[PDB]
Symmetry: C6
Subunit: 91 residues, 6 copies
Amino acid sequence: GIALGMIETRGLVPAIEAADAMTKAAEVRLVGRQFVGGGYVTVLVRGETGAVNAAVRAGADACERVGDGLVAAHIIARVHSEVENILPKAP
Amino acid sequence: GIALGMIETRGLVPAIEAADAMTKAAEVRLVGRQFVGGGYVTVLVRGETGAVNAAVRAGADACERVGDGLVAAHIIARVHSEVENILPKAP
Amino acid sequence: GIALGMIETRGLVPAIEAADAMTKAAEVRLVGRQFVGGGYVTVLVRGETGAVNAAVRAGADACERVGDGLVAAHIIARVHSEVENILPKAP
Amino acid sequence: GIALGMIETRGLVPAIEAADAMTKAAEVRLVGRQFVGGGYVTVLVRGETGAVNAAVRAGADACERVGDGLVAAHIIARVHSEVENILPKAP
Amino acid sequence: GIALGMIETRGLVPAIEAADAMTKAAEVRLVGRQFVGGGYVTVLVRGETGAVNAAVRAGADACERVGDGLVAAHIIARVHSEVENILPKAP
Amino acid sequence: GIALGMIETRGLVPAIEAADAMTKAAEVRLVGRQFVGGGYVTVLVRGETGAVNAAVRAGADACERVGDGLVAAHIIARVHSEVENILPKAP
């Protein structure tokens, strides 16, 4: 599956719980954890459409109350192939 | 084409949704995704003048409500040769 | 043990006092100290479930009044295998 | 010419338009684009005194309305030779 | 001596005066100067307990009025050996 | 001489104008320009005690109205040998 799920948080601790809740929620693979600058952290997962939708909803609910909380939660079920050049394949 | 499109966001998730909307909207290549410092991210595209105009406006409309949102959307249809030395050629 | 403890602070001094209180409070190993960006720091410990619970609560109580203070204190007693790829094994 | 022109902005997008407006305004060479930290970006040009004065005035006017806008615009027509050791020669 | 002293400041200038006041105040060795992110800077010294206590008190008083001032001032007279893996030995 | 002068600013443009005013004001060498994190920049000079005093006060008066301005201006006429290990010798 090539659908993409993304959760952005303030700090690394909410991000690490988001990643746990996502990967326990459905069959998805964790491809990236990016320190964006100025406090933001983003975790990326790939999998099938049904799986990525459940994973992102679970991560969003689990990290909102942790540390400085949630920034963004977002799905793109089929990115353009051009966007693959800025998406990591391994953490 | 050598027209330049650029979109700056707060955080990485609005920038990836910006990159996706831009490349599906017209024939543009993604030449870079830059971590600016302090939370800003900038995505950059190249192509013919009309393609880049259609691309930039679609990415702005798409990322506006994603995460912490949109900072800038802007076009330079023919940069001076000088500026090419600070523009990346692939991301 | 493979339970995970995490404490996020504003600045490096509250995080080192957090690491000290955590490791003296129960049998946990210090696997990482991460400079997150924008001032956040995160310290991470591993061990059995009860050791990590006692560790995390002691570090929170210790760093709360140090410097700019505590951001998050949180435990994941069995992370998914997926998340292991973004957790450091030594600092 | 060895006079120096400098424009500092919030974000990379206003900086890239500043560089375009400067180099289209008079004969100057673009020597640097620096990510300062915490959002600031600085572009540096060199050339003759008359040229650097026109270039900086044009860049300042062109970038004020772009993204998060302008921070500083400044000329030094002849830096001390000691200052050359912190001025880049190539972008 | 293995006791640890720590001073965190906003900016590098208050940190450099803190380090001067600490090392002139008692026999301590300067082991680290860390750029934490988002403006914070931390200086670390080691020595005996009596020496580290005088050093930190002097540094704290000397840097409060310099630049953007003091963030934290803190002693741990005997860190756990696990914490040694995140403490530098040389600046 | 081994007296130390230091000026901290918000952004890179006020710091370069600070470096220029300092080196033209008396016989001082520029030993470093440090990107601190979060937007702060620090420039550092060495020389005899009177040269460094004249240098520092001139740089403060010059950069005050440039960009986001001046954070600190400060002199240490004889640092302890300990601190030399965190001071750069050339920029």
